[PDB]
Design a binder for this molecule. Structure first.
Ligand code: MG
Ligand code: MG
Ligand code: MG
Ligand code: MG
Lengths: 443, 443
């Protein structure tokens, strides 16, 4: 109980907020909210706010249903970019049915249910540290994004320098002032691409931090006349954007992935988690990469994980184990992209990893032979397998796998399948300028 | 120990810095950094910051490797152009392997190793005073550099005058406020070309000053709506940019290059250093001039050193001995250009000079006959030789010479050659508008 009702009332009185955003996330990952005056703060705290519940279902909404908007007190945050005409505050809200039951279609409720399963299994918390990457594009005269980048930087380069602008520095400073924990920020290898690293907190707080980070990055960029994009592959021939998850499992004693007497300073729980992640990776590749453009990033190379393997020496595997040990022991999954929904992503990941622990699966031997060059026979000889190359194959894998369905729940599963199938069908029937430019003259 | 941890913490508290740049330099000389909030200052001081170590390898990075970022306390500098939303500070950081060993590929660690060799040989310090030259170009409407210069000045001319602008004066003032020692500044013979001279400090501090000077010049030129360029030969028919090194060797008694009883008021150590520099000049010409455009500056003339000779009267040799003596006795090398990496440059220079002392080589007799006009037979009769005329020949000379390889280390040597051969091959296969404009109609 970080905050209480009286604390929220006192904060609203003493920083004098007049606008409150009760925000939530739908299946597609879009940040949605209802906006109320500060005079209705009491009704929000009393959990009596109605809203059109079909909104969270996305564009496939059919039947309107009124449902509650139970908020969370620990997520009270006041934005500074509010001028003098009243402050603005946001609160992450749970979705509840009118019968005082959490909605099955709420990703946050699904993540809470999966975490409850973890806790009743014997663990305490599921820490996550994400490393999102975003692109910045110069706006046009009509406040429209262009295809030109703000600077021609490089990997870890000091590209934006100083003396005003430097949107990454301003974003980091605003996030720090607002009350977030930032480890480090740098320039990614692609021009105009930046990465900001976060500390390690709980899974739900990790989702809240990710969503708030997306909102803050978009807002600050817009103010500085730029456009912030989290689409994985904005341009061809340019490196994509990733959201690598550094995740660790904790118990009553402490870190469950650390053991000085084990191989690689890893506990058997860590190996079971690795086996569970590797076995079902093809299953949840769709959840971790929910967009068509996401699979354009997953191409064979030296930085895009398109194989199913784990390593700790050669790096660039599907799952990488950082050299740090002790309380910082963790397993990194590099196939996640910023367009993914964090709630569903760690829901399916936790389920897969925990199933690997329940089944006590033995992970395959790590590969440190730089798996990009070996022949197809060599890859087939080892347990190396490729991730799905398109959204349709990933959807088929989702429809085949059953554990990921349980981790996602029913309602979320069918809604995700319907939306993704509609999107794939729309992409399939479209005619692109590539086909015209390479067949109009030839044929 | 100029500063300690507590001093750094007190400074961060009392000038209220909120952004810290842990900056370093790769093989190619590009300034790179990782950016952290002030809340992580403790972790930086604890030498526990990870970063992608393949970044310093340049564009030839293959395998990702995490490695430490051990900072240096004596390089704590706070930038003034930070507005009111928190200050910005930088710290030069050493690159360390995860096993508490300095990385072999770090130029700074290589320079430290060479300096350790010097100290164990019997010397104390290797003072350097550089004289970099830079160009200023007017930006376009889209903040893009143009081919027009800010003013049509001359050699030592009072071209930028006063009443605002005058980017050189502002650069000098900001550098002085920041805590750098500046001897003098003036206008170079080319229009829009300026030179700023530095005092004489240690080699590592000289590198830090050079890198900070480049960063500050670029930032200030950008803020005044100009572009600062350190490319040696921006335009054809216009004098190039040089970074002459005024270097001296010190011992316990004092200056090792000064002797009142010796010829030209020079000690035998100075003559051995001169012989070592002259013998291996063709070897390290590639390191001192690493770009393709650099050798366009090294053309026969009256100001570009393309010969291997030393003098103190006629001036414009490869190596010039200034008339000043005593504690200011020094040897000037005029073949260095601003695009070179200072760490590698003085690493190879110190090695060559010290090898000349170890071998007690006798330098050739100085030439004061204005070596531009004598016939090729006359040049061949004397020990006058030409520097490599292209990057490829310089790379071949590097591959032949072994002492320079030892001075550079292994990892740096193979990475440098690899990247430079890729740059050379890319230049060789390109088709330039010169070929079109002089063959499209003729043939
Ligand atoms: Mg990254
Ligand atoms: Mg990562
Ligand atoms: Mg000069
Ligand atoms: Mg000079």
């Amino acid at each position: 109980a970080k905050y209480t009702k009286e604390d929220i009332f006192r904060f609203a009185d003493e920083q004098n907020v007049k606008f409150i955003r009760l925000q939530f996330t739908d299946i597609l990952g879009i940040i949605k909210n209802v906006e109320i005056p500060v005079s209705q703060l009491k009704k929000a705290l009393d959990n009596k706010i109605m809203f059109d519940g079909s909104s969270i279902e996305g564009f496939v909404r059919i039947e309107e249903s009124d449902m509650y908007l139970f908020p969370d007190l620990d997520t009270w945050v006041v934005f500074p970019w509010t001028a003098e005409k009243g402050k603005v505050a946001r609160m992450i809200c749970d979705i509840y049915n009118p019968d005082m039951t959490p909605f099955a279609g709420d990703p946050r409720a699904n993540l809470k249910r999966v975490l409850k399963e973890m806790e009743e299994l014997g663990f305490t918390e599921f820490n996550l540290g994400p490393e999102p990457e975003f692109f910045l594009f110069k706006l046009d005269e009509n406040r429209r994004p262009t295809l030109e980048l703000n600077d021609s930087g490089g990997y870890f380069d000091l590209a934006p320098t100083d003396l005003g602008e430097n949107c990454r520095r301003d974003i980091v400073l605003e996030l720090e002032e607002m009350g977030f924990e930032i480890e480090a920020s740098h320039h990614e290898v692609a021009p105009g691409q930046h990465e900001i690293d976060f500390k390690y907190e709980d899974a739900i707080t990790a989702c809240d931090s990710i969503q708030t980070f997306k909102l803050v990055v978009k807002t600050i960029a817009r103010k500085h006349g730029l456009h912030a994009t989290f689409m994985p592959k904005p341009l061809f021939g340019v490196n994509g954007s990733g959201m690598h998850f550094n995740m660790s499992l904790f118990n009553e004693k402490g870190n469950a992935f650390f053991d000085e007497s084990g191989e690689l300073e890893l506990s058997q729980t860590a190996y079971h988690f690795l086996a569970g992640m590797l076995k079902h990776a093809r299953g949840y590749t769709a959840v971790t990469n929910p967009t068509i453009n996401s699979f354009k990033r997953l191409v064979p190379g030296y930085e895009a994980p398109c194989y199913i393997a784990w390593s700790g020496k050669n790096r660039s595997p599907l799952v990488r184990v950082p050299s740090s040990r002790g309380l910082s022991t963790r397993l990194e999954l590099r196939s996640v992209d910023p367009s993914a929904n964090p709630y569903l992503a760690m829901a399916v990941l936790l389920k897969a990893g925990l199933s690997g622990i329940k089944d006590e699966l033995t992970p395959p031997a790590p590969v440190d032979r730089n798996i990009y060059g070996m022949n197809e026979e060599e890859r087939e000889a080892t347990g190396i397998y490729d991730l799905p190359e398109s959204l349709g194959h990933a959807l088929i894998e989702l429809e085949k796998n059953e554990i990921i369905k349980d981790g996602l729940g029913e309602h979320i599963f069918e809604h995700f399948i319907e939306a993704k199938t509609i999107e794939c069908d729309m992409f399939r029937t479209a005619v692109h300028p590539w086909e015209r430019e390479q067949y109009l003259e030839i044929y």
